[PDB]
Amino acid sequence: GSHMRLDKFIAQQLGVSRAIAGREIRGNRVTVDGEIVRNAAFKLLPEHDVAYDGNPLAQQHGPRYFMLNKPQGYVCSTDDPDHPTVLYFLDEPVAWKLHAAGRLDIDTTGLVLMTDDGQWSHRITSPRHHCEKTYLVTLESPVADDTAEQFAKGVQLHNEKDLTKPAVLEVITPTQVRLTISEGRYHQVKRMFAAVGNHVVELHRERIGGITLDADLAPGEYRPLTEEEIASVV
Ligand SMILES: O=c1cc[nH]c(=O)[nH]1
């Protein structure tokens, strides 16, 4: 049930203070659905059509942010037509306006941030930025004892120029590890373990910057991000 004060909408649109927006509203320069509204506190709804001096002012719907626990078998973009996208799990209006601020392959599960705020998104996904992500990785074979050092110094991916930035590995079981990287190269985690002689069997993302996947969010479930999560992702 999105809505907002008519004075805040006008201040937003004209680039003025709320106090000056109120002056204009009282000055009979603002119309809603064709009728003059002189009340700065008028509750503006999405269906309303606002005009300033006769000029239509389309309503720019606020930005939305969601936390999704991505399941296997679905993809994070319409690039590939052979598999259904994660929008299948979202029950929101004009959901097609949403994109993943950091995509995950078809059988990788975990934290995906869905949003329609392009600036917020780029800040997180830019290849020039340092944003940490943590994954829970299941391997085909017991991790080699020099792999942590390897990842700490950086490894070279098959046919890539530069080494991977330092990454920290924590062993949970011999075939299950937690890995934190600050990059976003294509299929980086799988290629990193391949380079050192192992094979990723399962991959689950637990964190991105200051946002961690809720322990009780089941695969396929999602929720709006809190005001705090939005203001502190990275
Ligand atoms: O970060 C990574 C690495 C490999 N594959 C993914 O889906 N994500």
Q: Which two tokens stand for residue 206?
A: 């637990």
Q: Which two tokens stand for residue 82?
A: 């052979």
Residue 27, number of CB atoms within 10 A of its CB: 9
Nearest alpha-carbon partner for 222 in 97, 69, 92? 69
Q: Are 73 and 89 in contact (CB under 8 A)?
A: no
Residue 105 catalytic?
A: yes
- How are beta strands 133-139 and 176-181 bridged, if at all? antiparallel
SS3 213: coil
Q: Which two tokens stand for residue 19?
A: 């106090």
DSSP conformation class of 75: B
The secondary structure element, H or E, covering residue 139 is: strand 133-139
The secondary structure element, H or E, covering residue 34 is: none
- Which of 3.40.50.920, 3.40.50.720, 3.40.50.1000, 3.30.2350.10 is the CATH number of 68-234? 3.30.2350.10
Helices 6-14 and 18-26, axial angle in degrees (round to 10): 110
Residue at token pair 């008028």 = 42
Resolution of the structure in the document, Å: 2.0
Q: Which two tokens stand for residue 165?
A: 């930035």
Domain 1-66: give its CATH superfamily.
Answer: RNA-binding S4 domain (3.10.290.10)
**From the CB of 72, is ligand 1 less than 6 Å away?**
no
- The rounded Å distance from CA 196 to ligand 1 centre is 17
CB-side exposure of 8: number of CA atoms within 13 Å? 10
CB-side exposure of 221: number of CA atoms within 13 Å? 8
**From the CB of 188, is ligand 1 less than 6 Å away?**
yes
Q: Which two tokens stand for residue 228?
A: 């705090």
Q: Are 162 and 120 in contact (CB under 8 A)?
A: no
